[PDB]
Design a protein around this ligand. Sequence first.
Ligand code: 8BU
Ligand code: MG
Length: 267
Amino acid sequence: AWEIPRESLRLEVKLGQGCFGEVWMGTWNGTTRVAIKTLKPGTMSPEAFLQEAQVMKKLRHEKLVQLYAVVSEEPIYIVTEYMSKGSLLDFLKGEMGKYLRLPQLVDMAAQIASGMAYVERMNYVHRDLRAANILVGENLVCKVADFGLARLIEGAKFPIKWTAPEAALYGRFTIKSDVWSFGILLTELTTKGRVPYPGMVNREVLDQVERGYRMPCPPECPESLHDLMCQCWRKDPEERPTFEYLQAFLEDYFTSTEPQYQPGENL
Ligand SMILES: Nc1ncnc2c1ncn2[C@@H]1O[C@H](COP(=O)(O)[C@H](F)P(=O)(O)OP(=O)(O)O)[C@@H](O)[C@H]1O
Ligand SMILES: [Mg+2]
């Protein structure tokens, strides 16, 4: 139904590759430039590879990478919208990361919060919210991507440095655990793509997170923004803010929260 013929595609350029299979740029019906999330020959079972595409079928928002089409047999493809600027993580680390200041970074955060607020309304969980799974387009447009672990509320593993403790420990994945991940994402944005918890290996991470350790306010980051991070990192998942709140907060940030912001050397 979302199905198309392999005829219609043509995989041109190989952009990355991620161990569950491959990702190419390409065209579709000749007319349209697309991205094609493929699979090298039988990696992970074809139908658990199917269900990222079904998650993407039910979801549609301007701040989510739009599904275009699917090819449900072999070799499988997942045809999606193409984002010219690649992953947010590489963008922050790369050449353009120098020039990004807090107003640009907060606006990127606002967009991501907007996309997740939609996920919130639709009663889904992403379970893998991080800068590496955000895609940038033209005009600094940011969209949430990679719904391989996304599921309706009622495989592989999970990066502990981005995962809420209750989810990493007891498998309790909610929209509130995604809120935790968003808070971690905010540190990625404000540190130009640096790995969270510097010098801390994976379960030094959780054991400290369980003693109540939280990442400190990044250099040149306003404390009001670090306060927002800390709210996203509250031990009780239910004390955590909504993405609806986060979106409005970030959209209005430089008028309501930091009206006297002045540019620094990095932020
Ligand atoms: N819609 C799009 N427009 C433009 N570029 C896109 C794009 N989608 C992906 N890329 C690009 O494909 C690369 C390799 O896949 P990745 O490193 O992302 C990982 F594998 P991915 O998480 O996709 O694989 P998997 O974990 O198996 O789902 C990434 O660097 C990403 O920028
Ligand atoms: Mg990815």
